[PDB]
Design a protein around this nucleic acid. Structure first.
Length: 229
DNA sequence: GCTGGAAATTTCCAGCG
DNA sequence: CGCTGGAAATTTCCAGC
């Protein structure tokens, strides 16, 4: 009757990518069919368990990348030594060599996934970074403009402008966008566009246009990592 | 199977020597 | 010119129906 299965998990995970830490507002979510009806406490324990599992997954993948880079580094060293000593000619080189290998691995980014309670391919990175980002944003707008989130501003921070977007997109639009993420959650691009108080209806697009959903996500992540440092 | 969204891959582009 | 890093576009992948 109260146990947890897979539907409640998927719904939760999605809700976490949407609102980060949501234990504050579980009720409201249950109260609008966002989450299946279950107890506040049990959802709390499931959330804690999920974030725990994400922490552990990221940890294990970090260990893995570490060891792989150790080995690749060793190979790089032993290769340099041979180039200098002259046992390898520099111009008769294959394009696949310990150097290019160590480099590509150095700069490789890839999904960090895990399974949880019979739900498959959850993104630990997305979960953690989303909780942090949305916490930083909530605290950022509440500590200053609580009685009117719309008056939020970046101050004298000037984030680098957008590249070849189809709408005249300025700092103002960044502010409004962030306010919208604070209001409806990460991903709710339709509600953000349609809110007339934000007044950015004719600057979002869901010859293909720009910016769409993905582009909004990138812009939000960049804006927040920028405002931090 | 099908399909939407995520993930991976490719392409585009600006900044630089 | 080519290199390189970042963003956009394009293709592929996969879980859940």
């Amino acid at each position: 009757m109260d146990s947890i299965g897979e539907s409640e998990v998927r719904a939760l995970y999605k809700a976490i990518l949407k609102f980060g830490n949501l234990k504050e507002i579980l009720d409201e979510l249950i109260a609008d069919g966002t989450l299946p009806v279950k107890s506040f406490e049990k959802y709390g324990e499931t959330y804690d368990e999920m974030m725990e599992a994400a922490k552990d997954c990221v940890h294990e993948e970090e260990k893995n990348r570490k060891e792989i880079l150790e080995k690749l580094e060793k190979h790089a060293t032993a290769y340099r030594a041979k180039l200098k000593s002259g046992e390898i000619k520099a111009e008769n080189q294959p394009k696949d060599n310990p150097l290019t290998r160590l480099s590509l691995k150095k700069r490789e980014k890839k999904a960090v996934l895990f399974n949880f309670k019979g739900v498959k391919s959850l993104n630990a990175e997305s979960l953690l970074s989303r909780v942090e980002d949305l916490k930083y944003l909530k605290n950022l707008i509440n500590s200053n403009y609580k009685d009117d989130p719309l008056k939020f501003s970046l101050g004298n921070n000037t984030p680098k402008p957008v590249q070849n977007w189809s709408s005249n997109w300025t700092k103002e639009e960044d502010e409004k966008l962030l306010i919208g993420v604070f209001k409806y959650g990460y991903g709710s691009w339709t509600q953000i566009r349609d809110d007339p108080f934000l007044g950015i209806t004719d600057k979002i697009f869901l010859s293909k246009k720009v910016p769409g959903a993905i582009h909004l996500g990138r812009r939000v992540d960049y804006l927040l990592s920028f405002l931090r440092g």
